Design a protein around this ligand. Structure first.
Ligand code: LVY
Ligand code: ZN
Lengths: 381, 294, 789
């Protein structure tokens, strides 16, 4: 527990410092926009999430040069069916850093993008160049007032500002939700739909993963907090699409808490029954949380979840430090013992003084969140 | 530049064969290192499709490498498989052409088991030589693999267990150095011949060389007439002189087998296991090469 | 696509404000009462109150203040609505004709702004130089009071203190000065600012920022000769005039938070204080300088929202939770103690938390029985058509749910009471109440400080006498949520079924709950069966001889066995928490607190549930009802009503599993309950009748119309709006527009029955103006529409 959590976020394996942009582009809510799609991007991007890319193909390089001159925004499709390139939703990605390199006589472009706005796909058109454009509708972010705003007594308005955290939360609930007695429901029900309470319940689980304090690292805005947590939850694509479809931060935070409590096991997606790890082994080796997207030397993007222990995995080959996403650690390819599907990599320290000495980086695309005992899957809110 | 199976990029040549070459390749999606056997379509000596089929039948055995993909890329047939460590000939060279009785005996145990498995799957290997026995990598570094199934032949029907007919007038298959006496006489190869070849491999690690090794002749047809006659003029007791009796017991047993007769693998493993115990050795996986790396 | 008609059956009864002054005449003492959208004007007489005028506004009254500027013969009235409509009103009478003329008006909402935590604060300067408003955090809105500000133009001053608790304008200041309590990381402080109208900013206040009590909530500006300000907290009452600081910590005020006040004497010698529990105190100031502060407990009143001293010891108590009162104080007559005597009581049905329609007497005409009030104010109210005739049954605790059981000739009422923790280990009640005063009582069998504990109960109340025959107490930490009266399976018996939740402060989501089946027969309550479930039973419905219960996000169907036990038939795991449950035939309406609406159908041939359609538009939803097979009525955030519709005929499967929003309306009330029924005697232009009960004690009615009737009444509305004089010059369309802070849409699929009905009250020349395509032909239409309630 001494690595330097600021290291993976820097993406130092990408080389020399990239050119940075300060400007920002946001489209009006509910507006219709035509945005280009990067052909080989397969990730489901969450607003506020960092996406590194290495573009090799001349058509991809050209498209990015054009974006860097215009709004710097591309569409990242949330694929329902990846094979037939089907998508109903997606997220805009704004390039904030770039670097053009002439590696081996070929123009290569490295990019760092960030998720900005959620959208509904209205139409997809592939042009005569092979590069496709998405006719999109910008999905608004629903901000609700306190559930008590329409049910508060004017005489108790001067009691709404408030000065052993459990005793504090008990008083928070009694005072904030006092006027719940004018309604059909108790204070404890309103708490289950209260942003601050829901965020404090999430923080308690995030502290279980990282020893960094809420004070600085975690945002105060429910929208940003909810998106920051959504980005680092190791769930399958069908669940992530449902999570992306949520417009209210309350519903997003509730839905996250439910996933965090229900899904305790992580199995191999190909096997569905082979257990790889549990939520108890999840830990943050990055400021972003336990999981972030990294790009490999050939431009393959992996959302890599860091865990202390993993089982049912075979190690292929010997360790390597080449293009390591966690500087100071060497990687060894890890496959499932049953189906031999690539699950991730084992990371082993190069120096004896380093802690942890070993951990596993599992690629989200290979995992399947599992409910213990015998039941199906459901994401409430 | 050269990508096979959509994800394996060729790094460098790491070997050769009758078919073509063996390359180190890297899975561009995750960094995984693999071996890629490349064979020209319209090659003089094709074996890759046959090997790919034979690896399907042999899959599941320990010491049998895993096949990732078989297919075509450009004007080549491609076999993508497990990257394995060095061969016994590479390790013999590394150890200055000298192995201790402890290494030879630990190896012998795994080599009988490797041939035995191929035999349970109704095949004879027909090319038993130090070069076809490779140690694994990483987790598999003390596990020996028998590879190169291009000369492998079915010796019996899977259901009926009917053995192949007895033929003579067969040209020799495999390397002449470790070939059985009967394979030299043109007699058809069976289980006994793989076992007898293994005895030569062990004697070759024991004595730096074999009695018929330094026999030169202009043509390959003349090169074999000497090896064959030297093998036949050399009694097992002369070849195995100064070595434990078990090595002569092994070769005499194999040469005593009938054409269709199954070797008693337990008996042959036991000869070496009882010797290993008697010499006060442990199966600690400390081979000669393990030590040179310490 | 729906065509609905919404009309008030009973106007709001809850009081949110009251002021005294000289509004009707410079010689008359008035009592002005705000009842949400209603404003009542009274003349204070020696006998009591003389009703003078009652007006309705196209808005929810947030601020109501009287003021007498320079040159004015009598007081004017400032009103700010919840939709930010500001106005200055004048009373004018000529002979018999009375009119509330509009002097100035305008909308004061900002295009940017976080509506404040402490809500809207509206203060008027003692010299009538300006109106100060705190609508949004980090800003103070100023409306200069001039004759040339008929549009009510305003500017904002930046306020560095982001968390303002309370603010008042001080007396005896050369420049307008605000005094306020705020909170920052260090704690609570009192600060002053001068207000420059020229500079449109704040200047250094007359006296320094003083560090006050952690729970300081109330600021009282003392008039001359005292001056300065009184600051009230949970333990202390402090005085601040700059250099002068006088503090008192009376133990008498420690029991409950003081949440309202009123000045008695014009020089600020005496003040009335009211706490959250109905205690009435007198704050006295001994006198150029203030010698000392004193508190005196006068006695008990209804939980006061607002207090107003009238004259001759008479005080009007404005209540939101219970009945309003006129109380006589006997402050003097020093041989007898200080005591409060109630002279008059004024019916308040609010909050209506639940209700049911019962045909008790006439066997044709329906009666409404509500769960009204909260805490000691809790009661049952029996509402019938005579004006509306209301009977009151005090419970002295909170009624929560109600259902009638014809067979046993009684009502089942879920109630709750607060008990305080003991030194001996246990809990003590605060007063006797319905659940501690039943003629027979029972307790559930248990398993395994001064803090408030909520105890839940099932009351059996005789339908004739309204006596509490039996009270059944639930387990410690058990919260009773849902109540049903029904027959199940092949069982001839009628049962009372209670759905509960186990609530512990450490657990956020309930992991335990019970479904308790009771039988009230031969004048005795017995527990027939009990099923323990792995969650909170939020809702239950008798579903075709079976019991449909919602356990958290699950919808479970139980069968009643011959062994008199509940047997799980099927489950349906929902994407949402099944808060609201409604059934019509084999159709089920599942909703949540966030307006997630789901439609399910029981498939008897498969023995499971199938989703028909859904609609997820995040907003707070307070109630839902099935109008018919295709229409769903709901109550949602910022006092709106909505209608959702299905289309079982649609060619595409995306369309037929989509619910269309067909009606939107700003009601101005918060609905807790929707109830199918009528209060009128059972070729009509209306179809159906859904009654609803609100937080303010308002009772409304929703009915469906034909396209022809809707189109006629809609045109009639636009015509009526051109002729009717709106108090404060508020547009009806603006008022009725669907409202949230993020969006404002015009009302659709709803006719304002209150507006249509007001055609009967307009003059004959005005009636003729409306019917200019015959006025008597329209009177017939409108009189036919009045007959539905
Ligand atoms: N060296 C090489 C060659 C081809 C593909 C790949 C690599 C390295 N790697 C990953 C391995 C884990 C890591 O931490 N960083 C990476 O970049 C690949 O996916
Ligand atoms: Zn697997």
């Amino acid at each position: 527990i001494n690595f330097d959590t600021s290291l993976p976020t820097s993406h130092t394996y990408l080389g020399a410092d990239m050119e940075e942009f300060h400007g920002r582009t946001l489209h009006d809510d509910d507006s219709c926009q035509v945005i280009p799609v990067l052909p080989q991007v397969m990730m489901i991007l969450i607003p506020g999430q960092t996406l590194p890319l290495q573009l090799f193909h001349p058509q991809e390089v050209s498209m990015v040069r054009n974006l860097i001159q215009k709004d710097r925004t591309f569409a990242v499709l949330a694929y329902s069916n990846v094979q037939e390139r089907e998508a109903q939703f997606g997220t805009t990605a704004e390039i904030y850093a770039y670097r053009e390199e002439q590696d081996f006589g070929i123009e290569i472009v490295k990019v760092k993008a960030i998720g900005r706005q959620r959208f509904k796909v209205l139409e997809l058109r592939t042009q005569s160049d092979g590069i496709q454009q998405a006719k999109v509708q910008i999905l608004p972010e629903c901000v609700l007032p306190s559930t008590m705003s329409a049910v508060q007594l004017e005489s108790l308005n001067k009691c709404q500002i408030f000065p052993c955290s459990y005793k504090w939360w008990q008083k928070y609930q009694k005072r904030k939700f006092h006027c719940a007695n004018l309604t059909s429901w108790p204070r404890w029900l309103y708490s289950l739909y209260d942003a601050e309470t829901l965020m404090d319940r999430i923080k308690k689980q995030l502290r279980e993963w990282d020893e960094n304090l809420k004070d600085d690292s975690l945002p105060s805005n429910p929208i940003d907090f909810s998106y920051r947590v959504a980005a680092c939850l190791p769930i399958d694509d069908v669940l992530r699409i449902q999570l992306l479809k949520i417009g209210s931060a309350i519903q997003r935070l509730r839905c996250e808490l439910d996933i965090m409590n229900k899904c305790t096991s992580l199995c191999c997606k190909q096997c569905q029954e082979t257990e790889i790890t549990t939520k108890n082994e999840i830990f943050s080796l990055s400021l972003c949380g336990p999981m972030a997207a990294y790009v490999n030397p050939h431009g393959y993007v992996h959302e890599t979840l860091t865990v202390y222990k993993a089982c049912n995995l075979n190690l292929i080959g010997r360790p390597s430090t080449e293009h390591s996403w966690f500087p100071g650690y060497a990687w060894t390819v890890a496959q499932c013992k049953i189906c031999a599907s690539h699950i991730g990599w084992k990371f082993t320290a190069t120096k004896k003084d380093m802690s942890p000495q070993k951990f596993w980086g599992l690629t989200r695309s290979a995992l399947l969140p599992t409910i213990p005992d015998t039941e199906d899957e459901i994401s409430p809110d | 530049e050269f990508i096979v199976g959509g994800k394996y990029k060729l790094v460098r040549k790491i070997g050769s064969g009758s078919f073509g070459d063996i390359y180190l390749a890297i899975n561009i999606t995750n960094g995984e290192e693999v071996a890629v056997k490349l064979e020209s379509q319209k090659a003089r000596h094709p074996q890759l499709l046959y090997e790919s089929k034979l690896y399907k039948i042999l899959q599941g055995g320990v010491g049998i490498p895993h096949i990732r993909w078989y297919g075509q890329e450009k004007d080549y047939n491609v076999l993508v498989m497990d990257l394995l460590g060095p061969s016994l000939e590479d390790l013999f060279n590394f150890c200055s052409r000298r192995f201790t009785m402890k290494t030879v005996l630990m190896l012998a145990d795994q080599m009988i088991s490797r041939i035995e498995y191929v035999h349970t799957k109704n095949f004879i290997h027909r090319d038993i030589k130090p070069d076809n026995f490779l140690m694994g990598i990483g987790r598999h570094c003390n596990k020996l693999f028998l590879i190169d199934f291009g000369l492998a032949k079915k010796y019996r029907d899977n259901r009926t267990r009917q053995h192949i007919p007895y033929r003579e007038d067969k040209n020799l298959t495999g390397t002449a150095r470790y070939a059985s006496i009967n394979a030299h006489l043109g007699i058809e190869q069976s289980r006994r011949d793989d076992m007898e070849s293994l005895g030569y491999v062990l004697m070759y690690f024991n004595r730096t060389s074999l009695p018929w090794q330094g026999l030169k002749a202009a043509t390959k047809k003349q090169k074999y007439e000497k090896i064959s006659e030297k093998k036949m003029s050399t009694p097992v007791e002369v070849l195995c002189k100064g070595f434990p009796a078990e090595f002569a017991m092994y070769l005499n047993y194999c040469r005593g087998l009938r054409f269709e007769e199954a070797p008693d693998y337990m008996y042959l493993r036991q000869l070496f296991r009882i010797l290993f115990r008697t010499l006060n050795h442990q199966y600690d996986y400390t081979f000669d090469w393990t030590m040179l790396k310490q | 696509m729906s065509y609905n008609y919404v009309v008030t059956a009973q106007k709001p009864t809850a009081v949110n404000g009251c002021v005294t002054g000289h509004f009707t005449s410079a010689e008359d003492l008035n009592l002005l009462i705000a009842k949400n959208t209603r404003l009542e004007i009274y003349v204070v007489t020696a006998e009591g109150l003389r009703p003078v005028k009652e007006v309705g506004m196209y808005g929810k009254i947030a601020v109501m203040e009287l003021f007498r500027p320079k040159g004015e013969s009598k007081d004017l009235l400032f009103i700010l609505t919840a939709k930010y409509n500001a106005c200055i009103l004048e009373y004018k009478q000529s002979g018999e004709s009375i009119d509330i003329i509009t002097r100035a008006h305008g909308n004061v909402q900002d295009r940017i702004g976080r509506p404040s935590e402490t809500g809207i604060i509206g203060i008027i300067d003692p010299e009538c130089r300006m109106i100060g408003l705190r609508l949004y955090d980090g800003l103070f809105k100023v409306i200069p009071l001039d004759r040339d500000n008929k549009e009510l133009k305003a500017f904002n001053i930046r306020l560095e203190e982001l968390h303002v608790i309370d603010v008042k304008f001080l007396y005896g200041c050369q420049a307008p000065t605000i005094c306020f309590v705020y909170q920052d990381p260090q704690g609570r402080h009192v600060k002053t600012y001068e207000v420059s109208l020229r500079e449109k900013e704040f200047n250094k206040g007359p006296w320094k920022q003083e560090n006050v009590e952690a729970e300081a909530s109330m600021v009282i500006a003392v008039p001359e000769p005292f001056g300065g300000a009184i600051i009230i907290g949970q333990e202390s009452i402090t005085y601040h005039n700059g250099d002068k600081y006088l503090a008192i910590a009376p133990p008498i005020i420690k029991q409950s938070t003081i949440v309202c006040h009123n000045r008695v004497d014009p020089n600020g010698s005496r003040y009335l204080l009211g706490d959250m529990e109905g205690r009435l105190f007198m704050l006295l100031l001994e006198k150029v300088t203030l010698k000392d502060l004193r508190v005196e407990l006068l006695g008990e009143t209804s939980i006061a929202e607002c207090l107003t001293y009238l004259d001759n010891g008479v005080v009007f108590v404005g209540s939101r939770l219970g009945d309003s009162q006129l109380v006589k104080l006997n402050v003097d007559s020093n041989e007898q103690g200080s005591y409060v005597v109630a002279m008059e009581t004024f019916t308040n049905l609010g909050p209506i938390v639940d209700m049911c329609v019962v045909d008790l007497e006439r066997q044709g005409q329906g009666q409404l029985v509500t769960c009204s009030g909260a805490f000691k104010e809790g009661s049952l109210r029996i509402i019938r058509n005579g004006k509306l005739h209301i009977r009151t049954v005090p419970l002295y605790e909170s009624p929560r749910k109600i259902c009638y059981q014809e067979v046993s000739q009684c009502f089942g009422v879920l109630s709750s009471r607060i008990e305080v923790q003991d030194t001996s280990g246990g809990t003590t009640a605060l007063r006797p109440s319905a659940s501690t005063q039943a003629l027979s009582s029972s307790v559930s069998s248990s398993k395994l400080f001064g803090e408030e504990v909520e105890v839940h109960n099932l009351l059996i109340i005789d339908q004739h006498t309204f006596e509490v025959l039996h009270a059944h107490q639930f387990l410690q930490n058990e919260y009773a949520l849902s109540l049903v009266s029904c027959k199940l399976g092949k069982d001839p018996n009628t049962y009372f079924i209670v759905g509960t939740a186990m609530v512990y402060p450490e657990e956020a989501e309930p992991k335990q709950g019970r479904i308790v089946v009771f039988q009230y027969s031969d004048g005795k309550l017995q527990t027939v069966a009990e099923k323990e479930v792995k969650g909170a039973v939020y809702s239950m419905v008798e579903f075709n001889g079976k019991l449909l219960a919602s356990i958290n996000s699950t919808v479970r169907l139980y069968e009643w066995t011959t062994e008199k036990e509940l047997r799980t038939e099927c489950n349906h795991y929902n994407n949402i928490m099944a808060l609201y449950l409604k059934t019509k035939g084999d159709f089920i309406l599942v909703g949540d607190l966030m307006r997630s609406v789901l439609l399910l159908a029981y498939k008897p041939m498969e023995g499971n549930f199938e989703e028909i359609a859904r609609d997820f538009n995040p907003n707070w939803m307070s109630a839902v009802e099935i109008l018919d097979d295709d229409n769903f009525l709901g109550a949602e955030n910022a006092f709106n009503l909505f209608v959702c519709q299905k289309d079982s005929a649609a060619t595409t499967d995306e369309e037929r599993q989509h619910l269309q929003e067909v009606g939107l309306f700003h009601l101005g009330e918060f609905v807790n309950v929707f109830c199918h029924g009528s209060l009128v005697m059972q070729s009509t232009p209306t179809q159906g009748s859904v009654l609803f009960g609100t937080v303010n004690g308002m009772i409304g009615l929703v009915t469906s119309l034909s396209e022809s009737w809707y189109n006629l009444l809609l045109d009639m509305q636009n015509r009526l709006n051109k002729v009717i004089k709106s108090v404060g010059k508020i547009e009806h369309s603006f008022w009725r527009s669907f409202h949230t802070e993020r969006k404002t849409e015009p009302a659709t699929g709803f006719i304002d029955g209150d507006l249509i009905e007001s055609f009967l009250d307009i003059s004959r020349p005005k009636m003729q103006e409306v019917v200019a395509n015959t006025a008597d032909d329209l009177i017939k239409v409108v009189e036919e529409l009045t007959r539905i309630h």
